[PDB]
């Protein structure tokens, strides 16, 4: 139970033990919050390829020592060529795993962009040291853990639709990884290396741009060096908000988790949980009917702000709380199929 | 999907949420640059009402357009206090993500937990469409279920969500206390 | 008090409670040997009725006699499924390890918690004197113990319960594998 | 869960300690050896509670299916007396059987740990116990949560001149976390017993100490008590549940006893129904546990002196009784519950 403690440096906590030790040791050298994020970003890339990576994307929301929030958008962008029912057949059916398995269900990667945008702007290292260890790690390999072995034998099936994977994740003669077996990744050192060396242009441009263009024309896939080049992190404002005297700082569109968080901490508010404590029945259906209209509203206001108008501002609006909270009744639901996004207010 | 936090000595926080969306992604790599590609598409809404990998649905906010962001429930988040570090906090778990970040945050504030029992607490979800409360296995005792299920609720155990990896800072006499944890989830 | 098991590829295991009562026992050392004295004659009843450290109560049975022992509620104790070792466990805890030591076989045996799960689950004690039903903090939802109080309980909320040091034995295809589990609480 | 499918595994209060246990299984040694190196461990870096100055109990199954178990519980001085700690008045003396070297039993740890290596180890006590030597020669880190239990227990160690000068820094200062914590002394009492055994604690310089530090602060253990100290090996008690063994510790202690006793009485019950945590289930735990305890306040204690109807307590037919006395959504006010329910009676005793 005992939470782990740290009154120096500070904390750098992630999924794996390589990276999270890897992260703590920049701040034990001196590097800040940035430093030690970027490191872990790299080194999730090589020890946790299941989630960790160079070839997606993601969000960082950053509070800097003084006083500033500030919002990091390295989500994926949909190609150049991308079209609204590009996944549809000729009869606007959706066609089996076309964007879940293979090259098309692939949007342009802001992994390395993200971490090369923070890092200039708000790190104190120079990015060639902060990626050392993933590197090393990619070149000498790691142990394959208990879970990795699973996970890595549940995508099995999906790996072997395609060569590239097969090479990478799979021994000889395609065979399972099992717990314990050293995994090398050569060509992912090459990669890293070259972003080591040339920084973001070194996964953008040049060679590795080269590979990715010409892999993907050869599988059907629609991404080119045209949508790499162009590819742009953008830097946001946090959606904000406050619960009950502390300053809640999350996410903005892209993402809809920091304004759905908000805006169901803001009808929480409106009840005095701590009353009856964690698990009471009463705190939980104040929470699930919060949940149920976030939800709703979500499937119809939210999407990228840059294409679409996205009512931030009046979705996070503590009045508009305050209306759904009073629709909450004492034991009774809202069934999902009488909820209504927006609940007509909103104008 | 994966989350990171991380808050240093001078007073910086920075809550990371990244991923190639579903295990593996696409499962395809890039022959030559030894990558797994993304396969963040399924995020966008590539039919109105049409469920995707994680039962979320969309209508024209939503839809694919030339180098849009897809939709993400990705929650990276940082509460303060007095203006200065007291939660960084997020999650990986698709649709989950909004809901997982949210009970740790209220289990610290409403119940006064400390990051350790915040993130190792049992967690419900509701997202409007399934019309289910999802909880985890022993979760939620037979009273509980029993008064929410006269409500009207429809509970389903399903399995454990999120991987939360938080930090709490608490201001010292001299400097601060940094209080981490990992999710004994995964 | 404080327990800790042993279990060895051979089969043999070892349940171990020892202790010097109270925490650090009498608080007296023997000045040259470098130990403390054990206070374990408060174990005994040493006036009938009178309750002892851990609200216990005893006449005759348990009244002090020269080269006597004193009652003690210590349970090490080892389950066993065909003669073959299943769980070793034991636990401090004054009059509460016997509770504590229950409920973790409880939860293994009754609701299939792995070893882990089990030691962590909250914990209840029923002692008879004093009349209450004793929990932990997050223990129990308000349901449950409306429910409770409703019966006739006077629930009360104490210190955290015990520091259970357990083994798990689960036969394998070829042999044998071992899980253990240390206590939160510890 | 920590895990191991070689050597087994050994598991403390302790990690120090723990370890210690994990590499005597790793070298060869069997249960019985591991568990003596960490009771000796645990003497030096859990002093709240690992101890040679105190006593417990050894539940053990050996492989070849036999259940022992081992008595090394504390006696009472040889001059101990019903009413020692109370005054003229017949009144407790406050804090007399609680601090101080009155309120000690005669220690049987040493007795104990030797006791169960020679019948059962496979390792000589000499080489099992330096590890312990080592840790209190050499030192530990005082762990976070050992620096709060010394500061708490800080007013009852100023009582004594002898626990002033080993759990406090000079000074009088309370150990901070971090702080390596040496126990010479301590190291030379262990150091007797890798060079004698048991009689290193028992008799000869040790039992010397030991007597005169109760001379001089109001003791009664005398060398006689620790050179009459006897460990007892007694059949453990024994139940099961739901198919299961349960294999525990007989008195002295009344644990095994009502823990089979309480079992006894949910196995009427199909707890797997509702899960964890209903309240249904914890009402016939707690019911059962309410009996259980007021059984106890009676007809527990030390078997060896009084008559304890052990085999009628943990009886499913008793367990039963109790079962069916249970009313459902209702508790039985502990005002009303009788010891033994009328089914302990022998007679007009």
Redesign the interface.
């Given at each position: 139970?005992?939470?782990?403690?740290?009154?120096?440096?500070?904390?750098?906590?992630?999924?794996h033990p390589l990276?999270?030790e890897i992260?703590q040791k920049v701040?034990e050298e001196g590097?800040?919050?940035?430093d030690?994020?970027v490191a872990?970003?790299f080194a999730?890339?090589v020890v946790?390829?299941?989630?960790?990576?160079?070839?997606?994307?993601?969000?960082?929301?950053?509070?800097?020592?003084n006083?500033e929030?500030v919002a990091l958008?390295?989500?994926?962008?949909?190609?150049?060529?991308?079209?609204?029912?590009?996944?549809?057949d000729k009869q606007?059916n959706?066609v089996p795993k076309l964007?879940?398995?293979?090259?098309?269900?692939?949007?342009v990667?802001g992994?390395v962009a993200?971490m090369e945008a923070?890092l200039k702007k708000?790190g104190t290292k120079k990015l060639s040291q902060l990626i050392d260890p993933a590197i090393k790690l990619?070149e000498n390999g790691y142990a394959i853990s208990q879970?990795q072995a699973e996970?890595?034998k549940?995508?099995r099936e999906?790996?072997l639709?395609?060569?590239?994977?097969k090479?990478?994740?799979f021994k000889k003669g395609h065979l399972d990884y099992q717990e314990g077996d050293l995994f090398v990744?050569?060509?992912?050192?090459?990669?890293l290396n070259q972003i080591k060396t040339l920084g973001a242009k070194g996964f953008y441009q040049g060679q590795?741009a080269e590979?990715?263009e010409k892999?993907?024309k050869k599988?059907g896939?629609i991404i080119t060096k045209e949508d790499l080049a162009?590819y742009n992190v953008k830097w946001r404002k946090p959606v904000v908000g406050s619960?009950?005297?502390?300053?809640?700082?999350?996410?903005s569109?892209?993402?809809?988790?920091?304004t759905?968080?908000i805006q169901?901490?803001n009808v929480?508010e409106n009840a005095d949980?701590?009353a009856?404590?964690?698990?009471?029945?009463?705190?939980?259906?104040i929470?699930?009917?919060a949940?149920?209209?976030?939800?709703?509203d979500?499937?119809?206001?939210?999407?990228?702000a840059?294409?679409?108008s996205?009512p931030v501002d009046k979705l996070i609006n503590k009045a508009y709380a305050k209306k759904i909270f009073d629709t909450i009744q004492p034991?009774?639901?809202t069934?999902?199929?009488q909820?209504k996004p927006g609940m007509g207010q909103l104008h | 999907t994966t989350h990171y936090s991380v808050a240093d000595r001078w007073g910086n926080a920075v809550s990371v949420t990244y991923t190639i969306n579903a295990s593996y992604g696409s499962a395809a790599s890039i022959d030559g640059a030894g990558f797994l590609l993304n396969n963040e598409m399924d995020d966008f809404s590539i039919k109105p009402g049409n469920p995707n990998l994680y039962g979320l649905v969309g209508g024209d906010a939503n839809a694919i357009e030339a180098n849009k962001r897809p939709l993400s429930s990705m929650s990276p988040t940082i509460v303060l206090k007095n203006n200065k570090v007291f939660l960084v906090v997020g999650s990986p778990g698709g649709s989950r993500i909004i809901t997982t970040v949210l009970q740790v945050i209220s289990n610290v504030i409403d119940y006064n937990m400390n990051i350790s029992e915040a993130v190792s607490a049992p967690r419900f979800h509701m997202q409007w469409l399934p019309d289910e409360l999802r909880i985890e296995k022993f979760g939620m005792p037979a009273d509980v279920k029993d008064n929410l299920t006269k409500m009207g609720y429809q509970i389903v155990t399903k399995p454990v969500m999120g991987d939360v990896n938080a930090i709490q800072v608490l201001p010292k006499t001299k400097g601060s206390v940094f209080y981490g944890s990992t999710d004994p989830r995964k």
């Open positions: 139970y005992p939470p782990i403690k740290n009154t120096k440096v500070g904390l750098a906590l992630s999924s990276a999270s992260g701040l590097g800040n919050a940035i030690a994020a872990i970003g999730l890339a946790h390829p299941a989630a960790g990576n160079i070839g997606g994307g993601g969000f960082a929301v950053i509070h800097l020592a006083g929030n958008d390295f989500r994926e962008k949909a190609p150049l060529k991308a079209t609204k029912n590009m996944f549809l606007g959706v964007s879940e398995d293979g090259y098309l269900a692939a949007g990667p992994t993200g923070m708000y990619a879970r996970t890595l549940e995508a999906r790996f639709k395609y060569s590239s994977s090479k990478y994740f990744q050569k060509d992912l050192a090459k990669t590795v590979l990715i892999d993907m599988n896939g162009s619960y009950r005297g502390y300053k809640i700082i999350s996410m569109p892209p993402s809809s988790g920091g759905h968080l169901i901490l929480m949980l701590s009856l404590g964690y698990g009471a029945s009463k705190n939980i259906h929470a699930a009917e949940m149920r209209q976030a939800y709703a979500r499937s119809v206001y939210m999407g990228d840059d294409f679409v996205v034991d009774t639901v069934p999902s199929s909820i | -």
